[model samples]
Target: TEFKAGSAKKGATLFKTRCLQCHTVEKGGPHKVGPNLHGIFGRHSGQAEGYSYTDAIIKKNVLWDENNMSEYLTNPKKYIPGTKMAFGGLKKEKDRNDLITYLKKATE
Candidate 1:
């Protein structure tokens, strides 16, 4: 199925509550852990300003898309052997899909 109608809104709340500690979706958030999520949907996996990208991610040089995100979310280490997104996987497909939807809206 396609993305849900309110997936973006649901994604925003989920991101703020669970992902804010590491990821940033806005222009002016702290970057102590991860890169800004603005325009991230189509972004290269390891491309961002000022963040020290991991060797594993740099090697892959992948762009963000539905398939890539799905694989990475399922297993980042499997996708890129030495990357550093330490959190456990987002097991539920719906949440992952919502995250992508949310990111698209936030960037737009």
Candidate 2:
């Protein structure tokens, strides 16, 4: 897939609308239905603090790099079957890119 860089500011808006119900991205933030996403980038998948992850996701042993994250956010179930996240995923490529931009910005 073509990876396009986008505005973190705009991405934050996308996060609020599409992801806030399930996630939180601040340091020491509470985990929602999903994991708290602080420092998610560069971290191992399914290893965030205080979040109980699915067996399938924990077994993937994947690093949460940009490419991996972009692909995962594009389709959570397809990326990791049996993941606990109930989101259907963001359908737009631009939206996925922008959301990644925001996560990279906010979770750092």
Candidate 3:
């Protein structure tokens, strides 16, 4: 699917509904089932503080940016084989776009 910019407002709602069970969006937020997502853009994959990432993710050594994030959010295992994220991927392209939008806004 082709990429598109998304709505931060709608994206925020999406995050609360879909991602909050595992991730925290605020800066300095405590890690939950997944790592805190503050400042995730431009950060390296699996490098969030206080969270233990799988060796597969750590070894990837890929930087997080919007493009890669969109791909990863589409399918974690497909993007990086053996990734620890167990959730099934977001199937809708629009949903993934919105989530990325919200992540960028919240992290900033």
Candidate 4:
């Protein structure tokens, strides 16, 4: 299915519930455990400010497009072996899509 902007609102709620602990989509929110997710899509991965990064992801220079985000969310460890995000993944495709849409809009 194609991505939808309306569904992104659900993703915002989902992110607040599920991802805010680690990431901040807004510019001023605390960095908590992960980095600010502002502009994550089209951005090089593992490049958020502050927070120490793992060796494995440091050199990767990854980007968070829809396809990459989908794959990475499905399996963080498998995608970036040294990422600190311990959360498993959103197994459902719809959920992943929603989260991605939310992130894209929120970050932009």
Model 1's lDDT to the true fold? 0.75
Candidate 2 residue 3 Cα shift, in angstroms, is: 1.8
The digit string of per-residue lDDT tens for model 1 on 4-91 reads 4348887788778777889877766556687776677777877777788888887798988766776787777777888888867778
How much lDDT does each candidate structure score? 0.75, 0.86, 0.85, 0.79
Error of 4 at 34 (Å): 0.5
User: Residue 103, candidate 2: how far off, in angstroms?
Assistant: 0.8
In model 3, the Cα lDDT at residue 11 comes to 89
Ranking by TM-score: 2, 3, 4, 1
The residue-by-residue lDDT of candidate 3 on 81-106, one tens digit each, is: 99878877888888888888878788
Question: Worst 10-residue stretch by lDDT in candidate 1?
Answer: 1-10
- Candidate that scores best on TM-score: 2
Q: Flag clash pairs in model 1.
A: none
Can you give the TM-score per candidate against the true fold?
Answer: 0.83, 0.93, 0.91, 0.87
Count clashing residue pairs per candidate.
0, 0, 0, 1
Q: Which digits, one per residue and each the tens of the lDDT, describe model 4 over residues 1-108?
A: 344443878888889888887878886766778877776778787677676778777777787688788888888888888787898888888888888878878887
- Model 3, stretches more than 4 Å misplaced? none
**Model 3 alpha-carbon miss at residue 103, Å:** 1.0
Q: Kindly report the root-mean-square deviation of model 1 from the true structure over all alpha carbons.
A: 2.3
- What are the clashing pairs of model 4? 45-62
Once superposed on the true structure, which residue ranges of model 4 sit more than 4 Å away at CA? 1-6
